Amino acid sequence: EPRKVREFRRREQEILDTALKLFLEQGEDSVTVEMIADAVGIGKGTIYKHFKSKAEIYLRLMLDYERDLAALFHSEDVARDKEALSRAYFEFRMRDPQRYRLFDRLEEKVVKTSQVPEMVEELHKIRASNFERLTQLIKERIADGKLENVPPYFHYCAAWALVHGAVALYHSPFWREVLEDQEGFFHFLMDIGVRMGNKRK
Amino acid sequence: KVREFRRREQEILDTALKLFLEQGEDSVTVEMIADAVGIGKGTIYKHFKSKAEIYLRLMLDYERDLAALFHSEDVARDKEALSRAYFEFRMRDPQRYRLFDRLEEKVVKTSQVPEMVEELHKIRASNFERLTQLIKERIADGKLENVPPYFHYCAAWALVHGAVALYHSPFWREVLEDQEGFFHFLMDIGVRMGNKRK
Predict the structure, then answer these.
(1) Distance (Å) from the C-alpha of residue B73 to the closest C-alpha of chain A?
(2) Which of A73, A69, A58, A52 shows the shortest CA–CA distance to A114?
(3) Domain boundaries along the sequence of chain B
(4) CB A160 to CB B166 under 8 A?
């Protein structure tokens, strides 16, 4: 792409990365557009060229997350490894549990309210596409004999439940200190997700 | 008679829970519980000094029910059937689980009635050891992967927590509410979680 556009996009990305870091550390309600600009080192007026409001930043972060999930499914291979893809999916969903929880709060705050209707409609569209991709992966693992031959939404809902509960584990005042440094436990959870609903003989 | 005191106390508890789920616990007052039972507010105070006492009693009764599940006392109990029964117990009535999650913040974390909360922590600690002992036994039998027991404990907690949330989804609850096969599918997943590969 042209150099001017690339510079504009990299500045936009730095704003997004900085804003997300501030939201997780201090809480999203506390952080203001001025505070993000100070952290990036730019004037606030520069931020408003990129985003009209904090609600646009919230929605952009969630759109970017859905785009990252979509890219996970697409690969340059004729016959992708479905078990490796399933593992990558659970890793993507369970890493960064504080971000998951933040997005749960933003769902009530800006998505359910359709604070920016065009952006929320885009978010629903890509989420529906990602739902179709996960359902197709489930159907292919069923057709390959790996997953039990039950309705695909059985597997979808089990995966949703495991991810949701796993995120909650990392917000426990008791368990978070125990688990935060345990990479083996994280991979144990990943193995459980991949093995969930596997067919038995 | 002592008898007699108990049945009214149970109807108060059964009625209060069923208003809490309907209606939301903050909305429900002691007067509303008394009206539904029909026994007037003065009678309630003979059993419970406050709504917080009713909250904590419901949670104590729940922990006692979980303890009763483990105490089969058989010399060679079926651990897989016990594991399945545990997941069934935890995942049935998801609305009650969610209410108790709210009551944790409201009356347990605040130690609203300290004597009752100390008893609740005591039985919860006993139930934790009972579940951990079941996990260790399934590990020792070659059924579960030989990892720290808390690995298995935390996986079980996560599955239950996520399953309860599933039944509160505005989308999924209508889909799942009548699906006994899906419920048994989740139970199968819980029992098979962390199983050693043959």
Answers:
(1) 31
(2) A58
(3) 1-48, 49-198
(4) yes
Closest CA to A193 of A149, A141, A124, A145: A141
Least CA distance to B171: which residue of chain A?
A: A157
Q: Is A116 helix (H, G, I), strand (E, B) or coil?
A: coil
DSSP state string for A73-111: H--S-SS--HHHHHHHHHHHHHS-HHHHHHHHHHIIIII
Angle in degrees, 0-180, between the axes of helices A152-169 and B149-166, rounded to the nearest 10: 120
- 3-state SS, A139-164, equals HHHHHCCCECCCCHHHHHHHHHHHHH
Resolution of the structure, angstroms: 1.8
Q: State the Cα torsion B10-B15-B20-B25 to the nearest 10°.
A: -70
DSSP A42: S
Candidate from A150, A178, A189 with C-beta closest to B155:
A189
Closest CA in chain B for residue A174:
B154
Q: Residue A19 and residue A12: Cα distance in Å, rounded?
A: 11
A190 at interface of B, judged by CB pairs closer than 8 A: no
Residues 6+ apart with CB under 8 A from B29: B51
